Amino acid sequence: MKSIILIVLDGLGDRPGSDLQNRTPLQAAFRPNLNWLASHGINGIMHPTSHMSLLGYDPKVYYPGRGPFEALGLGMDIRPGDLAFRANFATNRDGVIVDRRAGRENKGNEELADAISLDMGEYSFRVKSGVEHRAALVVSGPDLSDMIGDSDPHREGLPPEKIRPTDPSGDRTAEVMNAYLEEARRILSDHRVNKERVKNGRLPGNELLVRSAGKVPAIPSFTEKNRMKGACVVGSPWLKGLCRLLRMDVFDVPGASNYRGKIEKAVDLTSSHDFVLVNIKANYPLKRDVIEDIDRAMEPLKSIGDHAVICVTGDDPVPIVFYTDGVMNDGVHLFDELSSASGSLRITSYNVMDILMQLAG
Amino acid sequence: KSIILIVLDGLGDRPGSDLQNRTPLQAAFRPNLNWLASHGINGIMHPISPSDTSHMSLLGYDPKVYYPGRGPFEALGLGMDIRPGDLAFRANFATNRDGVIVDRRAGRENKGNEELADAISLDMGEYSFRVKSGVEHRAALVVSGPDLSDMIGDSDPHREGLPPEKIRPTDPSGDRTAEVMNAYLEEARRILSDHRVNKERVKNGRLPGNELLVRSAGKVPAIPSFTEKNRMKGACVVGSPWLKGLCRLLRMDVFDVPSNYRGKIEKAVDLTSSHDFVLVNIKNYPLKRDVIEDIDRAMEPLKSIGDHAVICVTGDHSDPVPIVFYTDGVMNDGVHLFDELSSASGSLRITSYNVMDILMQLAG
Numbered sequence: 001m002k003s004i005i006l007i008v009l010d011g012l013g014d015r016p017g018s019d020l021q022n023r024t025p026l027q028a029a030f031r032p033n034l035n036w037l038a039s040h041g042i043n044g045i046m047h048p049t050s051h052m053s054l055l056g057y058d059p060k061v062y063y064p065g066r067g068p069f070e071a072l073g074l075g076m077d078i079r080p081g082d083l084a085f086r087a088n089f090a091t092n093r094d095g096v097i098v099d100r101r102a103g104r105e106n107k108g109n110e111e112l113a114d115a116i117s118l119d120m121g122e123y124s125f126r127v128k129s130g131v132e133h134r135a136a137l138v139v140s141g142p143d144l145s146d147m148i149g150d151s152d153p154h155r156e157g158l159p160p161e162k163i164r165p166t167d168p169s170g171d172r173t174a175e176v177m178n179a180y181l182e183e184a185r186r187i188l189s190d191h192r193v194n195k196e197r198v199k200n201g202r203l204p205g206n207e208l209l210v211r212s213a214g215k216v217p218a219i220p221s222f223t224e225k226n227r228m229k230g231a232c233v234v235g236s237p238w239l240k241g242l243c244r245l246l247r248m249d250v251f252d253v254p255g256a257s258n259y260r261g262k263i264e265k266a267v268d269l270t271s272s273h274d275f276v277l278v279n280i281k282a283n284y285p286l287k288r289d290v291i292e293d294i295d296r297a298m299e300p301l302k303s304i305g306d307h308a309v310i311c312v313t314g315d316d317p318v319p320i321v322f323y324t325d326g327v328m329n330d331g332v333h334l335f336d337e338l339s340s341a342s343g344s345l346r347i348t349s350y351n352v353m354d355i356l357m358q359l360a361g
Numbered sequence: 362k363s364i365i366l367i368v369l370d371g372l373g374d375r376p377g378s379d380l381q382n383r384t385p386l387q388a389a390f391r392p393n394l395n396w397l398a399s400h401g402i403n404g405i406m407h408p409i410s411p412s413d414t415s416h417m418s419l420l421g422y423d424p425k426v427y428y429p430g431r432g433p434f435e436a437l438g439l440g441m442d443i444r445p446g447d448l449a450f451r452a453n454f455a456t457n458r459d460g461v462i463v464d465r466r467a468g469r470e471n472k473g474n475e476e477l478a479d480a481i482s483l484d485m486g487e488y489s490f491r492v493k494s495g496v497e498h499r500a501a502l503v504v505s506g507p508d509l510s511d512m513i514g515d516s517d518p519h520r521e522g523l524p525p526e527k528i529r530p531t532d533p534s535g536d537r538t539a540e541v542m543n544a545y546l547e548e549a550r551r552i553l554s555d556h557r558v559n560k561e562r563v564k565n566g567r568l569p570g571n572e573l574l575v576r577s578a579g580k581v582p583a584i585p586s587f588t589e590k591n592r593m594k595g596a597c598v599v600g601s602p603w604l605k606g607l608c609r610l611l612r613m614d615v616f617d618v619p620s621n622y623r624g625k626i627e628k629a630v631d632l633t634s635s636h637d638f639v640l641v642n643i644k645n646y647p648l649k650r651d652v653i654e655d656i657d658r659a660m661e662p663l664k665s666i667g668d669h670a671v672i673c674v675t676g677d678h679s680d681p682v683p684i685v686f687y688t689d690g691v692m693n694d695g696v697h698l699f700d701e702l703s704s705a706s707g708s709l710r711i712t713s714y715n716v717m718d719i720l721m722q723l724a725g
Contacts, residue, residue: 075628077635114627114662119669125635140634254616264479264493265440270503271489272442300479307484 002272003308004044004228005301006054006352007263009294011312012284013337015048019284026319027229027336028284029291030039033041033298034321037312040305041323044345045331046352050315051239055246059217060123064245065214071136071243074128078247081175082216083144087127087135088152089205092185095159099132102205104112108136108193112205115191116184122343125180130297136211140178141174146215151200151208155256160207170232177210184208207267222246228274249273257281259297267300272318275356292351311352320345320352324359362688362723363670364593365663367420367626367715369656370644372676372683374701379646384699386683389653393660394685394699401687402695404709406493407718408673408682415677420611420640421591423459423505429610432511439493444610445594448509448538451577452492452500453517454570457550460524465517466498467570474500474556477570477686481549488541492573502575504545510535515576516546518722520523525550525572540574548725549573553661560671588609589625593671600630604642606627622659629687630662633670638720663687671724673698675717684709 001061010044012026020028064072065085070093089109108131117127123141128137147170148163160181163174175351185207188194194204222230234240243250253270259280266278270303280294301310303324312335314322319340330344346353373385380388380428408415409424413434417424429437434450442694443449443687447699453721454474471494478494488506495501499711512535513528553559559569587595590611597608598616608615616632622643643656663672667689676682683704685696711719 075631079630079635108626110623111661114630115665116631117662118665127632128629167701248423249614252619254619261477264475266477267482268442268493271491272444299476303480303483 003273003310004275004356004360005266005270005278005308006276006311006356007266007313008281009280009312011287011316013316013318014287015231015344020288023336025287027283027297027334027338028288031291031295031335033295033300033302035333036302036313037298037310037321038335038340039333040329041321041327042345043322043330043335043340043343044320044347045317046313046315046320046342046345046347046349048349049083050349051277051279052242054313054352055222056350056353057246058350060219062217062219064216064219066138067069067212067214068138068216069214069238070134071128071138072238072245074130074134074136075237076126076128076136076138076241077244078138078216079140080219081140081144082215083139083146084216085139085210086136086212087137088209089129089135090133090207090209091203091205092160092207097153097156097158097160097207097209099203100154100156103203104132105197105202105205107204108191108196111193111334112188112191116187116208118183120183121176122229123176123180127182128318132230134203135208137208139177141176143333145170145173145213147200147257148173148177148213150211150213151177152211160209163164177333181208181210207289213355218234219245219281219310222275225354229272231261231269231276233269233278236279247324248277257293258296263297263300267304270304309356311356313352319346322355322359363636364638364720364724365629365633365636365670365672366672366720367641367642367643367672368416368658369417369674369676370642371679373649373653374680374682377646381652383712384701385653387647387702388650389657390517391657391699392655393657393664394674395697396664397674397685397687398699398704399697400667400693401672401685401691401708403683403685403699403704405681405701405705405707406709407712408655408677410715413603417607417643418715419675420587420595423714423719427582427584429581429584429607430511431499431575432512432577433581434603435577436493436503438603439495439501439600439714440539440606441491441493441501441503442609443503444505445581445583445677446478446509447507447581448504448511448577449579449581450502452502453574453668454494454500454664455498455572456568456570457572462518462523462525462566462572462574464522465519465521467572468568469497470562470568470570471497473561473568474498475597476558477553477556479553481573485545485548488545490545495617498570500573502573504542506541509580510539511578511580513542513578515578517574517576518542525574541635546573546575552658573634579598581610584610587608587613587638589719591638593721595638595640596632596636597640598632599640599642601642601644608640617673620655622656626659626660630666633666671720673720675716680703681691684711684716686723687722691723
């Protein structure tokens with residue numbers, strides 16, 4: 001049975017401009033490889049995180065929630081049953097939140113994240129810091145519930161709130177979370193980065209203010225879910241992050257853009273994997289030339305039809321094209337927003353993975 | 362208790378007058394490394410006897426057996442995944458004007474090679490062929506299938522003026538592999554010769570890469586999992602194609618953070634929550650000093666994770682190196698500084714072989 005390569009082009013669709021003579025970047029672009037794919041394949045229009053459905057997981061049964069999402073955004077590996085918070089490094093002089101953002105200071109934020117990444121009891125606390133005051137906290141351990149309130153008072157002038165239950169399933173999490181917040185409180189207050197800050201007249205981040213608690217749900221392995229072996233040629237911390245949540249191997253291949261390498265690598269993994277998602281990227285003439293680049297990097301694809309199925313799709317409604325060998329052509333000859341609307345296919349994020357499994361046999 | 366093994370790769374030794382007759386390591390402001398030496402066991406490790414790596418024996422593999430082979434290793438260095446049972450060759454794109462090898466390197470032209478590499482990467486039923494291209498004429502072929510043999514010769518004749526060699530079996534068990542290879546190479550030279558980049562070369566008075574010359578056929582042996590060899594789950598925080606590829610060989614999870622010492626160090630620390638072993642590879646005189654100082658800053662988190670991890674730090678070469686092992690309640694053996702001089706005062710006198718032992722028999 002054949003392998004699958006699903007290539008998602010971010011940004012595509014777009015609208016016409018009189019700059020490209022009232023055509024989209026996609027219809028303006030010299031795109032012979034994508035056009036070839038179209039003429040030798042089946043064609044259509046797809047519409048709906050769109051990336052998660054594509055991978056065959058209904059979002060909203062499986063959507064992990066904003067907390068864990070941030071944690072994904074900031075490197076960081078969560079697991080089902082883990083509790084995630086969005087966090088701010090903030091200032092707390094004499095028991096009142098004076099600046100929920102610690103002036104948006106960044107220096108040292110990294111060592112402060114580490115210093116308050118720890119274990120206590122059966123529990124494990126991970127903090128990682130992003131841009132300015134932004135940060136994420138991931139807790140893991142027994143009994144975790146997202147049925148709790150926020151630490152963040154939501155405005156200057158209030159003390160940090162004690163976490164409260166919400167409903168009685170949260171009682172444990174709250175007791176545990178208030179005890180962690182205190183712990184982090186002293187460590188933060190005592191750290192040299194912050195003693196440095198007061199001296200030099202800067203605002204210290206001596207509170208980790210947490211909010212938007214979200215529990216990571218069931219989420220079956222990629223294998224469990226789709227009984228196949230999965231790889232992502234993805235650059236972007238959250239996709240890299242999500243792919244690892246579902247246990248698919250990840251490969252970056254960046255540059256010192258590198259479309260060629262991402263396609264060539266995705267073709268390589270065809271040897272050792274059943275399914276390879278490769279995610280592309282994200283002024284009109286420029287948008288055009290970028291597509292023309294992308295198309296040149298796609299020459300490998302026309303010849304693996306005997307051993308892989310190839311899907312290209314964008315990410316309201318976006319073109320989609322399916323090619324493998326022995327596929328009967330739709331009658332569509334170009335790949336773009338108009339011409340592809342004459343395709344036989346009218347599908348949804350969710351049908352993609354099915355059509356892919358069938359073309360593969 | 363998890364293990365983080367930090368290999369300081371290319372550890373500037375040999376004293377220099379510039380640093381007042383001290384080493385880069387000895388002159389570097391090293392409080393974190395030194396902290397570990399104070400709170401731990403110290404000594405000198407002798408990397409394994411007679412060779413591009415001592416990393417292999419740290420992950421607990423005797424490099425005498427299951428060294429992959431020069432073929433596989435080339436492929437490994439171009440970022441190609443290999444698995445047990447594949448055949449791997451070093452390769453050159455070459456010019457072949459009517460049956461004779463005229464330039465064994467296609468003049469070192471690189472432009473368009475990767476597309477040529479692609480066009481001759483293909484499934485021919487039960488066998489699969491993957492060619493990736495490197496700097497200049499440099500290439501590798503990996504071939505996958507049932508019962509390949511490396512008991513075969515070379516397609517490369519080693520000098521200009523001769524024809525490409527048909528592949529001969531060097532023993533009865535390579536007769537099948539030779540039949541497959543010769544047909545593939547004939548198929549390949551027909552694809553190449555007709556490609557647009559080679560046509561746009563003869564057109565433009567350049568040297569076409571119309572021939573794949575293969576040599577050093579090597580079959581990647583059985584090689585246990587990392588879990589199979591060591592009975593734990595491992596990850597590598599490494600950049601560097603060869604090392605990443607080997608890590609995928611051993612079936613460990615590979616992670617590449619991209620001078621992000623801090624970030625590699627703290628990714629390793631985050632991985633200790635879900636992996637029992639994590640390998641981390643870090644790659645004039647005052648500048649070398651100032652790098653070691655930059656590395657030392659990155660190791661700040663390590664100071665506080667000994668309650669649930671074991672930290673080890675050594676060097677490697679690019680000749681014995683310093684090594685320090687730390688965890689909670691280890692029993693400091695009296696050395697206070699990390700460098701190739703003061704680490705000699707420590708208790709430990711060991712080889713790369715011994716490292717797994719000290720680690721795992723120290724994590725409980």
